[PDB]
């Protein structure tokens with residue numbers, strides 16, 4: 001494979017479904033490089049657990065935790081970190097109300113080079129235990145020699161785009177990492193970076209972030225095919241925001257419109273949204289407590305019942321993970337028979353305006369509340385016109401490992417979306433328990 005897309009290990013499935021999967025101890029092992037220092041961008045941290053995932057010989061190397069916590073939450077994280085003198089913290093500014101730092105990324109500086117890891121798991125035991133999570137591993141980027149003047153840039157502009165994403169924090173600890181990235185050669189990178197940062201973007205900046213960033217890349221580096229109207233869009237996520245009183249408000253007017261972009265020229269396109277049903281959660285490996293990481297509140301859900309007619313069940317027989325609830329987020333553009341895809345995105349961005357952005361000021365300004373990061377796989381970046389879909393995820397240079405089943409299966413009439421803050425007392429989960437919030 002050229003794609004370097006991995007799932008995390010799932011405890012309790014047969015070994016065949018974990019053979020090419022990665023645990024966090026694998027990613028941080030000395031087999032991957034001799035660690036000098038690391039940056040951990042995330043939302044939630046268990047610092048005691050995290051330090052134990054580093055190899056003992058690397059446990060005192062510097063670690064930077066990049067978080068978005070404020071007030072007492074910030075104090076609690078600082079207290080978790082205080083016993084470890086090698087741990088520094090960087091608070092990402094969140095100057096727009098109701099934003100979140102969702103970006104999940106590792107920057108790993110070695111003796112031998114630099115590696116970037118963009119993934120979907122929080123840094124807590126449960127997110128690496130029995131969930132479906134996604135990981136993109138960069139190549140080992142070599143250092144650029146002293147006195148040598150090279151760009152170190154890839155055809156996808158990844159090096160410049162990653163630096164631009166870090167510059168948006170305006171943080172001194174991250175300027176140190178920007179300088180590290182400048183000294184390394186990232187020219188082998190074949191993915192495009194798609195980030196979200198908080199702000200109000202107009203003019204030349206409107207294309208930098210969110211769903212307009214995705215639009216721009218698809219216009220510039222994908223081509224339209226005949227019968228493009230028949231190629232569905234698939235979105236798959238773990239949380240749902242307030243989308244408006246009907247689909248024309250945002251979902252099918254600016255979000256879907258960005259997602260269906262192909263090529264530079266100028267809807268009936270089917271939209272499939274995959275989100276766990278109550279039954280999915282009840283019968284999962286973790287049972288109802290998996291629903292503690294699928295935050296969709298009844299307050300949000302009751303205002304947009306129209307949306308649930310787009311929902312399809314989580315199913316992942318191809319990767320043995322139908323009962324490993326998804327915390328990965330993915331978006332993709334399959335062919336009408338789901339045998340090919342025009343592109344694939346793995347990201348931290350959920351189905352929400354906060355993450356992808358919402359147009360303001362008569363369509364001239366894109367407002368984003370949150371930090372998000374993901375990587376886009378475009379066939380053109382691999383010398384191809386489209387990717388074949390891999391039949392079984394764990395069973396070549398042109399065959400993409402989609403981690404769940406296609407076509408997605410629509411909710412049955414008795415199915416309901418998982419809503420995390422109402423009780424389920426009608427049938428017990430795999431551990432014999434009910435759910436009472």
Ligand SMILES: O=C(O)c1ccc(Nc2c(-c3ccccc3)nc3cnccn23)cc1C(=O)O
Pocket residue numbers: 043098099100101102122238239292293294295348350
């Ligand atoms: O990706 C995801 O599914 C996700 C969803 C929500 C996240 N944070 C969060 C929570 C919350 C979540 C879990 C336990 C307690 C509180 N509540 C809110 C309310 N508004 C905005 C954000 N909120 C974080 C993530 C992530 O994993 O980054």
